[PDB]
Design a protein around this ligand. Structure first.
Ligand SMILES: COc1cc2cc(c1OC)OCC[C@H](C)n1cc(nn1)CCCOC(=O)[C@@H]1CCCCN1C(=O)[C@H]2C1CCCCC1
Length: 126
C-alpha cells in the first residue's frame, strides 16, 4: 500500500538526490508560505516502520516541534519544510535520514526504513 506507492511515485526531496526522503502530497494545503527554519510547527502524524511492524500516532492523543533544531529526524526537517498549512503528505525515509545504522532501540532497529503520514496544522515564526 502506501509505503510501496511512495517508493514508486514519490518525489525525491533530498538535496543530494539519493532518494533518502520521498514525498507524495495526499491533500493540498492553503497558502504560499512553507515553514522557514526556526518556526514552531504543529502537526498530526501517523508513523510506522515500512515493514508495518511498529506504529505510532499523534491523533492517538498535536505534535509540536521547532523546525531545523534537531528535535526530530533529518527527514522531518527536510520534509515538513516543503509543506503548506493544511497539507497532508506521505514520506518514505531511508535510515540515513532517520536513525541510521545505530537505530534507536527498542523502538527503531538498525537500518530502518520509516513511513509517515503528516498533516501540517500550523506554523508560527519564533
Ligand atoms: C526514537 O524514539 C521515538 C520515535 C518515535 C516516537 C517516539 C519515540 O520515542 C521513544 O515516541 C513518541 C512519543 C514520545 C514521548 N516522543 C518521543 C519523541 N517525541 N515524542 C522524540 C521524537 C523522535 O522521533 C522523531 O524524530 C520522529 C519524527 C517526529 C515524530 C516521532 N518520530 C519517530 O521516529 C517515532 C517512530 C515512528 C516509527 C514507528 C515508531 C515510532
Amino acid at each position: 500500500g502506501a509505503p510501496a506507492t511512495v517508493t514508486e511515485q514519490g518525489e525525491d526531496i533530498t538535496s543530494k538526490k539519493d532518494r533518502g526522503v520521498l514525498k507524495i502530497v495526499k491533500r493540498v494545503g492553503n497558502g504560499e508560505e512553507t515553514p522557514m527554519i526556526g518556526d514552531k510547527v504543529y502537526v498530526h502524524y501517523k508513523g510506522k516502520l515500512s515493514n508495518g511492524k511498529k506504529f505510532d500516532s499523534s491523533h492517538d492523543r498535536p505534535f509540536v516541534f521547532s523546525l531545523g533544531k534537531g528535535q526530530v529526524i533529518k527527514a522531518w526537517d527536510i520534509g515538513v519544510a516543503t509543506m503548506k498549512k493544511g497539507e497532508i503528505a506521505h514520506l518514505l525515509i531511508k535510515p540515513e535520514y532517520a536513525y541510521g545504522s545505530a537505530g534507536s532501540l527498542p523502538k527503531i532497529p538498525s537500518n530502518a526504513t520509516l513511513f509517515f503520514e503528516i498533516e501540517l496544522l500550523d506554523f508560527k515564526g519564533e
